[PDB]
């Protein structure tokens, strides 16, 4: 890899600089290089990895949605405009799939298999579910069902560990439940499951807030508010 000659610590330092400069493609390349050193990642490093790729794929998803909407309008009384909209939507889609495959490849080689603590293992399995979910958003072929089931399976394994090993207010556990609820609503055509999961997650977190410091309370309630916002949109 092009980062093979750079020290691990320098890659992490430069990822932090890239974040400050809003250079998320660079940030992701630095963090990929750091993962490829073969050592496990600390909590801060795991979050740097996620921030970088979430920003990269987030821009791709936003662009894909714009282009997909234009394409769908073109396929209604609509003047034929040639293959260009489809071609360019396909170009962005292929790039997005490539980023998702890269993240999934890092998780499979070898972040998940070396992650034994709940905070690392749940984090990575959640990420696996997320990037399969992003693949599912653009999937249409003989693979859509299998991609959806791969997302579901990763989220389910993460959920099972999180419920056994983490308190209901743990921010990773909350973010996982939030994203699995989004999977149910937006991917799996299961709005009732989404609503039930969001409600139970919110209520069980509410009942555990009394155990938390001021700073942890702030962290947990911020994520709980997203559960509440979705419940307001969904009901």
């Amino acid at each position: 890899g092009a980062m093979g000659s750079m020290e691990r610590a320098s890659l992490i330092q430069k990822a932090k600089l890239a974040e400050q400069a809003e250079r998320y493609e660079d940030m992701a390349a630095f963090m990929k290089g750091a993962v490829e050193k073969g050592e496990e990642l600390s909590c801060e490093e795991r979050n740097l990895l996620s921030v970088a790729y979430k920003n990269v794929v987030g821009g791709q998803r936003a662009a894909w949605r714009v282009l997909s909407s234009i394409e769908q309008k073109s396929n209604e009384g609509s003047e034929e405009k040639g293959p260009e909209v489809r071609e360019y939507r396909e170009k962005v889609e292929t790039e997005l799939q490539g980023v998702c495959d890269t993240v999934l490849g890092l998780l499979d080689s070898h972040l998940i298999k070396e992650a034994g603590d709940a905070e690392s293992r749940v984090f990575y399995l959640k990420m696996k579910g997320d990037y399969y979910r992003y693949l599912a958003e653009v999937a249409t072929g003989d693979d859509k069902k299998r991609i959806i089931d791969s997302a579901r399976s990763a989220y389910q394994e993460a959920m099972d560990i999180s419920k056994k090993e983490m308190p209901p207010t743990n921010p990773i556990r909350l973010g996982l439940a939030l994203n699995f609820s989004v999977f149910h609503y937006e991917i799996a055509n299961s709005p009732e499951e989404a609503i039930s999961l969001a409600k139970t997650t919110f209520d069980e977190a509410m009942a555990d807030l009394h155990t938390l410091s001021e700073d942890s309370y702030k962290d947990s309630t911020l994520i709980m508010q997203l559960l509440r916002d979705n419940l307001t949109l969904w009901t």
Partner: peptide, 9 residues
């Protein structure tokens, strides 16, 4: 309107 997923810190 699309559902809200987990946000960065």
């Amino acid at each position: 309107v699309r559902s809200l997923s987990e946000r960065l810190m």
